[PDB]
Design a protein around this ligand. Structure first.
Ligand SMILES: CCCCCCCCCCCCCCCCCC(=O)OC[C@H](COP(=O)(O)OCCN)OC(=O)CCCCCCCCCCCCCCCCC
Ligand SMILES: NC1CCN(C[C@@H](O)COc2cccc(C(F)(F)F)c2)CC1
Lengths: 1034, 150, 100, 50, 50
């Protein structure tokens, strides 16, 4: 193939043009997102049963739905929570590769058949099935700076005017309203209700009767009379529209002739559907829209479109309404992608500079400057073809593959240059000879790097999905680089390079270039002499190689493991957890202290604080809250002390002094779609119907036992809420019957007054809005207020609740958990420093085995993935190693020579490990992919060295030592210049400290160390391996 | 998958018209083979469990998870789960001038779980310090509480 | 029993709110009739898998279904692949005149 | 695969059974499939030897 | 027409507008492809240009 395209440079140029056009089309049409789909597909069912405790929701909703989640394909597991707020939340997790649309449709279809079995109130509120495996692209908050609009007003305005147009913006996949539309609130007064001889049941009945849509008919409708000429539709009673209309609702007319309206026994207003959650932006009332990106959409373009739509909206807003962006991580994505692109461009420029320094030829330097961009564009085309997107993983994989790309280009051009400078042949004949020398090596290298990189695509789980991005990117880049080195680079060398004299290698030049040429010639002579001396005493260096291998193993075992570096994305979170029974006001006060601290003690770093009172993480209630702190631009936060880690540490230290509250500040995970660390998530299952109390006792026993092992298990805690006091109303139905009070009336009165009851809809400004009846807040606060509520009897006489019911205080769970349809309790923990996750999981299994009868356990979350993909690596790499050996044996036509090449892995691995250890970095994904890239480059260099040596030994009569020395002399320059180019290209990643510096350092430090030690060691260890192998096996 | 999706999309149009008893029993749409993949029987070697006990254990502790196993298209229980059975005596119903309608109404009224609201629920008054869930009538759990239904 | 305006505000608006974000959707046209009927035709890009598009429309319609009136839910909201042209008309007559 | 998954689920269940409860397999054609395929594989190996 | 009222094409007219809009790019791409094929086959730019 190289000879074919040397006579046909225009055909090679046509192929290159096709590749570039395909790459450009892909670049214009590729999606862009921070990360790809990593989490396994999950479908989440949400239902609300207002006014209900955890047990009521669990027994009436959660269990009924869970007993019908059958016949759904590809389900890994299922979990559910039932909260004291009246909400059930069921998550069904499916294996990776499952079609999320099909999983969702199956789940909702099974729920549609389960729907008739649920309470009528749950059916009225609706059960929603969504995809919870994704996260918010953006959060657009709406605030009022005048105080004229409360939170409900802002929420209703956003719902009516903003949600539709934002949803219609291009690329927007989903919009969730941080709030709700208006609701007709009927705040009942029990005293007035008793005065006018009424109860909440009467109010609901009247509202339902006098606010409804009635089908009337049609004038002159078919079948008509034989002479009808007019046909018109008849309109009749329609839904109410104004608070005044609801106030005029008639409940009863008294005997004396007075009229009792709804306004007489209650206040009528436009409130919110729910009041559980209060959102504030820097202390001001706020609503919001959470925008999820559509599938296949460009995140940057979608964010820009959203901002443009909001800017268009701005003029029409009511005075004092403003738009803010509390959670804007798109700037982080933009700066990260820009840094990667800049790294690629600077790498190409550095390749040009190194080529000019070493070869002092302008056209030779131009040749790689054409070759590498063609390969990159082809790689973009290949990513687009297989439905990949431009994300952090793929872009960093491209950064890593730059080393192999530049190595291929440098190898081809430098070999042609050397053939010209030694044999004195013209460019065309020299290119023919060079490619005849190196083409088989290039093909074998392509196969070997395929063997090295493909196995990562076959890892399982979220980690496997992460690794597949790098695998596909690097494999495509390597294959395209080899194809270019076989097609275009020979043609460019044959057509562009100028002739060089037989004996000219830059000695006669003057100045810095002449000095550099003389110095490099002397260094080559010295290195050749040193290698020749080394080959006389190979045993000592074999012992040294064993020492290096032992040190490599030591460093590998002593290096901690991780998944992804934690990044300073310009935002972080602060959870507030108050003691059981804390009300909304106490949590609001604590959140106010947190906001004050962030806006005063960190005013130079924090831009805004979005405090949400009503739900934290792992729960939702009046005692929980979460604040999303946004930081200023990184340019305005210089130094380590002003980054997210330092700010979070200082904030946690400051908040530790807060009393009667656990306030904890922390940073986002690398991929927010997964909450993952070097820890375990553990489920304790009630396998025999023991009950909640026995399961709590078993959990306490397990927690104590785990705490008795501080050396292996750290911070083993429950992921749930402890039992809290509850107010039990024990109704004596015998008394109710004796007093002529229907228990249905008693229960309806209690629920409507204290829990709130949804009655029906009404049309406000052309939109359906719910009508809620609830007791006015004054009369449903304390237990004594129970005495303010009366119920009519069959005799017409009111009876108080104290007359037919007693009260007391008990203990109950505010949050009931189920796993795989059985009662469960979740425990989070992490292995102690120096201990692997597997050891902690084994110890937890052992401790669980000593638990009461009928208590089982399971692993869920990341622990499930660990338990599936536990031993898959070493097998996948034993297959890779075998395939590499087979490819090398095919290439060299020898069963023993492959070992001389294969013995080079530790040379780069040791350097990568040392660089990671000194810098303190962990054994994370980026480090592992960089390690594989270093191994690939080292193997490529060793393959070329051994190929040259064996070619000299076979095609010429040169001996083993002479051939080895000549081969290393020939290969020294390309190795050194490629290593220099790649090291200088990755310097910015190593030294970076700004946005995205975590991933940059993780990628760059290992690459730097591995490349440095590989270049230093291989150049005199590969000859030793080759000589030893040929002596022992010949 | 698509065949089942379309069949259920057509069935949800007929579902509102079906008798309420049919809906309460549960209409199911399966896509399975017409022959059993296997039969998993359950016995008691000690002989301390009757057929009904074994069937209830299988239904309550084994059937649901198996139905959730991937590849399982349908599960047929060779038995039935326990339920609270009220075996009415017509002579005693007539003695007290009662009917099955009264029994059903009493069961519905006196075996229920009701959402009773909260102490200090939102919107709360200023200065509220306590927030607790109100617990009320709960579903009966044994064959002694049903016998005490009035 | 609902006029065009009321059914549009109560049904058509609510349904077409959630119809944004479906893959390969060229456009959508809806009409609301005085008899309370509502049709919403979503036309997708050529070459789109009609079954997957129908599944996605169902998934997005669930988010609106509980927000519709109970009478609509009793009648049923259907999602199905649609065509605007009659393949054929098969008429039936009686040549005896006995049947109306 | 479905039979293997069912057996794994039953194995998860067995530790928590009441005393005396036992699982049996009165009807299962999967063993016939296993021995049939194994017999064909054995015939292949014997054919290579012959 | 007054401000605030726009227009669009649907159904057959939508397809007609799409075809008309995408015709010139189709012509350009086809001409480029044929030029590149000729250059590859006959190893020249003069022959493709002529
Ligand atoms: C030229 C030829 C080049 C071929 C490629 C070289 C091989 C790959 C080099 C290693 C790269 C991956 C590094 C890595 O992440 O390894 C660690 C990972 C799990 O270990 P981890 O949880 O990180 O624990 C760290 C301890 N603190 O994984 C490991 O524990 C390492 C897995 C083994 C590495 C492959 C070499 C050994 C293969 C033989 C395994 C034998 C057992 C399996 C038998 C299968 C039989 C078919
Ligand atoms: N009825 C409404 C009342 C208002 N709030 C709004 C809060 O949810 C917004 O807070 C956020 C902000 C950003 C991200 C998230 C994430 F964690 F969900 F991703 C939550 C919800 C219920």
């Amino acid at each position: 193939m190289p000879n074919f395209f040397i006579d046909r440079p225009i055909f090679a140029w046509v192929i290159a043009i096709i590749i570039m056009l395909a790459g450009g089309l892909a670049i214009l049409k590729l999606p862009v997102a921070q990360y790809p789909t990593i989490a396994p597909p999950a479908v989440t069912i949400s239902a609300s049963y207002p006014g209900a405790d955890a047990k009521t929701v669990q027994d009436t909703v959660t269990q009924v739905i869970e007993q019908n989640m059958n016949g759904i394909d590809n389900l890994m597991y299922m979990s559910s929570n039932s909260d004291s707020t009246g909400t059930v939340q069921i998550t069904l997790t499916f294996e990776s590769g499952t079609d999320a649309d099909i999983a969702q449709v199956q789940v909702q279809n099974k729920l549609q058949l389960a729907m008739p079995l649920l309470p009528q109130e749950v059916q009225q509120q609706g059960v929603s099935v969504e995809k919870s495996s994704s996260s918010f692209l953006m959060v657009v908050g709406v605030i009022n700076t005048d105080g004229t609009m409360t939170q409900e007003d802002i929420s209703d305005y956003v719902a009516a005017n903003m949600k539709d147009a934002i949803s219609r913006t291009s690329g927007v996949g989903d919009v969730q309203l941080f709030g709700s539309q208006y609701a007709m609130r009927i705040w009942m007064n029990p005293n007035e209700l008793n005065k006018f001889q009424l109860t909440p049941v009467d109010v609901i009945t009247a509202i339902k009767a006098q606010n409804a849509q009635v089908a009337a008919g049609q004038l002159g409708g078919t079948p008509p009379v034989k002479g009808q000429q007019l046909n018109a539709s008849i309109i009749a009673q329609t839904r109410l529209t104004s608070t005044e209309e609801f106030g005029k609702i008639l409940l009863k007319v008294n005997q004396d002739g007075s009229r009792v309206l709804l306004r007489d026994v209650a206040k009528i207003e436009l409130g919110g559907e729910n009041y559980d959650i209060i959102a504030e932006f820097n202390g001001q009332p706020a609503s919001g829209l959470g925008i999820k990106l559509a599938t296949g959409a460009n995140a940057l373009d979608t964010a820009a479109a959203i901002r443009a739509e909001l800017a268009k909206m701005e003029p029409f807003f009511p005075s004092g309404l403003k738009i803010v962006y509390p959670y804007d991580t798109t700037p982080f994505v933009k700066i990260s992608i820009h840094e990667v692109v800049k790294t690629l461009v600077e790498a190409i420029i550095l390749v040009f500079l190194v080529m000019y320094l070493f070869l002092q030829n302008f056209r030779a330097t131009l040749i790689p400057t054409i070759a590498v961009p063609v390969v990159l564009l082809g790689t973009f085309a290949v990513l687009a073809a297989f439905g990949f997107s431009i994300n952090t993983l793929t872009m960093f994989g491209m950064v890593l593959a730059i080393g192999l790309l530049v190595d291929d280009a440098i190898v081809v051009v430098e070999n042609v240059e050397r053939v010209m400078a030694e044999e004195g042949l013209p460019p065309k004949e020299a290119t023919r000879k060079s490619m005849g020398q190196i083409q088989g090596a290039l093909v074998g290298i392509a196969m070997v790097l395929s063997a090295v990189f493909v196995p990562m695509a076959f890892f399982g789980g979220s980690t496997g999905a992460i690794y597949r991005q790098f695998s596909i990117t690097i494999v495509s880049a390597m294959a395209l680089s080899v194809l270019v080195a076989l097609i275009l680079t020979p043609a460019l060398c044959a057509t562009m390079l100028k002739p060089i004299a037989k004996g000219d290698h830059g000695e006669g030049k003057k100045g810095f270039f002449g000095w550099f040429n003389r110095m490099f010639e002397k260094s080559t002579h010295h290195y050749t002499d040193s290698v020749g001396g080394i080959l006389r005493s190979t045993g000592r260096y074999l012992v040294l190689y064993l020492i290096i291998v032992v040190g490599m193993a030591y460093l590998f075992v002593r290096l901690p493991s991780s998944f992804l570096p934690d990044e300073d994305q310009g935002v972080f979170m602060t959870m507030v957890q108050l003691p059981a029974g804390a009300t909304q006001e106490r949590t609001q006060k604590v959140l106010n202290e947190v906001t004050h601290y962030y806006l005063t003690k960190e005013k130079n770093n924090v831009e805004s604080v979005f405090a949400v009172n009503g739900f934290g993480f792992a729960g939702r209630g009046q005692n929980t809250g979460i604040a999303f702190v946004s930081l200023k631009d990184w340019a305005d936060r210089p130094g380590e002390e002003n980054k997210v880690e330092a700010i979070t540490m200082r904030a946690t230290r400051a908040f530790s002094q807060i009393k009667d509250a656990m306030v904890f500040a922390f940073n986002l995970p690398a991929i927010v779609e997964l909450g993952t660390a070097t820890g375990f998530d553990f489920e304790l299952i009630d396998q025999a119907g023991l009950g909640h109390e026995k399961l709590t006792q078993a959990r306490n026993q397990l927690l104590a036992e785990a705490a008795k092992h501080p050396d292996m298990l750290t911070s083993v805690r429950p992921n749930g809420l402890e039992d809290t006091p509850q107010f039990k109303i024990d109704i004596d139905q015998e008394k109710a019957q004796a007093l002529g009070v229907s228990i249905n009336d008693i229960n309806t009165t209690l629920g409507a007054a204290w829990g709130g009851s949804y009655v029906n809809d009404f049309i406000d400004r052309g939109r359906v809005k719910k009508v809620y009846v609830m007791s006015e807040a004054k009369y449903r606060m304390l237990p004594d207020d129970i005495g303010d509520w009366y119920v009519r009897a069959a005799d017409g006489q009111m009876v108080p609740f104290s007359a037919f019911s007693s009260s007391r205080w008990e203990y109950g769970s505010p949050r009931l958990e189920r796993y795989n349809g059985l009662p469960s309790m979740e425990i989070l923990g992490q292995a102690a420093p120096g201990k692997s996750t597997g050891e902690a999981m084994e110890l937890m299994e052992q401790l669980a085995s000593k638990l009461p009868t009928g208590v089982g356990y399971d692993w869920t979350g990341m622990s499930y993935q660990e338990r599936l993909s536990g031993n898959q690596a070493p097998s996948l790499y034993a297959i890779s190693l075998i395939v590499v050996f087979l490819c090398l044996a095919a290439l060299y036509e020898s069963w023993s020579i492959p070992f001389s090449v294969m013995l080079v892995v530790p040379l780069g691995v040791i350097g990568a490990l040392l660089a990671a250890t000194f810098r303190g970095l962990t054994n994370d994904v980026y480090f592992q992919v960089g390690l594989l890239t270093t191994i690939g480059l080292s193997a490529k260099n060793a393959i070329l060295i051994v190929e040259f040596a064996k070619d000299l030994m076979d095609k010429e009569g040169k001996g083993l030592i002479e051939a080895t020395l000549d081969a290393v002399r020939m290969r020294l320059r390309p190795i050194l210049m490629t290593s220099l180019a790649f090291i200088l290209g990755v310097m910015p990643l190593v030294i970076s400290t700004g946005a995205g510096s975590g991933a940059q350092n993780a990628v760059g430090t290992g690459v730097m160390g591995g490349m440095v030690t590989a270049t230093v060691l291989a150049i005199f260890f590969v000859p030793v391996f080759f000589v030893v192998v040929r002596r022992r096996f010949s």
